[PDB]
Design a protein around this ligand. Structure first.
Ligand SMILES: CC(C)(COP(=O)(O)OP(=O)(O)OC[C@H]1O[C@@H](n2cnc3c(N)ncnc32)[C@H](O)[C@@H]1OP(=O)(O)O)[C@@H](O)C(=O)NCCC(=O)NCCS
Ligand SMILES: CC(C)(COP(=O)(O)OP(=O)(O)OC[C@H]1O[C@@H](n2cnc3c(N)ncnc32)[C@H](O)[C@@H]1OP(=O)(O)O)[C@@H](O)C(=O)NCCC(=O)NCCS
Ligand SMILES: NCCC[C@H](N)C(=O)O
Ligand SMILES: NCCC[C@H](N)C(=O)O
Lengths: 182, 188
């Protein structure tokens, strides 16, 4: 079984939408998932890779590039080819101010359930890491939910530090409107 | 009285930004992690347009109305924070932020890396002003969410954030690959 990581293009938007949806299902947060394909197509491709939101897709094939998967049909970039989008990583430049240099923040990293535990998640993170080194990025950060001990273990095995002392803060759209009237 | 202004940072503001980030590191007891130089800031802060990448707002204070409360302020570092040595204007604080991407919204938001008022200018409403400025900018640009992180012992900031209507979560954990971790993965 062969694998490839490639950059997302505008025609990949349906797959990206569905992957983010599956992330929301995994996190039990579907009520927060308001993304549309329209919104993704509007926001994902306004800059060059690495300068803003960037997406890598992991594709799988039983043949070289030129497991029960129930959703296979939803994830074929081309119906005539046995190539299936198995997972993705979505990230963008951040700014660790103590380093006075850009880093990367990983918003999502996700393998569809049938392709878990096969080394593909490692491949995705490796690809972000190697790109970070090449581009002189000094740090990669993301967040994980506390019950998600599977991801935490994965991250820790890949050499990530997972802290207990930092708390996420958020202003929602509604909170922002409220402040805006000041 | 004392008058206040928020403005975008320019390359000549790098010394002040450096010193403010340094004071942030002191506050957080993380000076061992503070390796930023003025050189690095000058080479990384101004490669893009405002709001489209790392962006800094400075809060300046002047005893005179600004060429766009009575309580006197003892500021020992005033001389380190004058954009013009002949001018009665002092950099009192900053917010440093950049576009993020809440994927569930499929639209850019903002993440705040630092928000900081120098100790002599705390508890006077200026922190509110900084956050308000980021928030208003977010609304104008159609941003759906603003996020940042706070350290668990920092009950002052937590309270401030909560009073500004922020949600402060218990369930999310910060994860990090250091430079060293990245080199190790690179050799796979
Ligand atoms: C987290 C995730 C991206 C990891 O991808 P993955 O493909 O399952 O992980 P890998 O198979 O690359 O695991 C890395 C290696 O460590 C091993 N390993 C040991 N314990 C592991 C664990 N708890 N999780 C994953 N791998 C583990 C794997 O077997 C693998 O070795 P291998 O190459 O010989 O198979 C994915 O599995 C997943 O769970 N996605 C759900 C979304 C999620 O949890 N997101 C976090 C947001 S809160
Ligand atoms: C957190 C911080 C940015 C807030 O700045 P600040 O200017 O002190 O905050 P404000 O003056 O706007 O408000 C602080 C609170 O003190 C009280 N206060 C402030 N000014 C007041 C006044 N004039 N009268 C009465 N109470 C007042 C209020 O409870 C106020 O909350 P409010 O603004 O909703 O009324 C500032 O304390 C700081 O720089 N600390 C460093 C810590 C940090 O930022 N860490 C983040 C990473 S862990
Ligand atoms: N609130 C974010 C600042 C934390 C510090 N820059 C760090 O690198 O841990
Ligand atoms: N790990 C990042 C995913 C978190 C999710 N999009 C949220 O908004 O809660």
């Amino acid at each position: 079984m062969f694998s490839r990581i490639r950059l997302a293009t505008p025609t990949d938007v349906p797959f990206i939408h569905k992957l983010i949806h599956q992330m929301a299902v995994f996190e039990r947060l579907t009520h927060l998932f308001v993304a549309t394909e329209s919104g993704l197509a509007s926001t994902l491709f306004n800059s060059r890779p690495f300068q803003a939101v960037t997406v890598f897709l992991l594709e799988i094939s039983p043949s070289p590039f030129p497991i029960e998967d129930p959703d296979r049909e939803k994830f074929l970039p081309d119906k005539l080819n046995d190539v299936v989008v198995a997972g993705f990583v979505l990230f963008f430049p951040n700014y660790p101010s103590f380093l006075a240099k850009q880093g990367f923040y990983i918003e999502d990293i996700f393998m569809r359930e049938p392709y878990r535990r096969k080394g593909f998640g490692k491949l995705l993170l490796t690809a972000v890491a190697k790109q970070a080194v090449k581009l002189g990025v000094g740090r990669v950060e993301w967040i994980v939910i506390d019950w998600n001990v599977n991801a935490i273990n994965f991250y820790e095995q890949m050499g990530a530090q997972v802290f207990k002392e930092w708390r996420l803060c958020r202003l929602t759209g509604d909170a922002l409107q409220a402040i805006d009237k000041l």
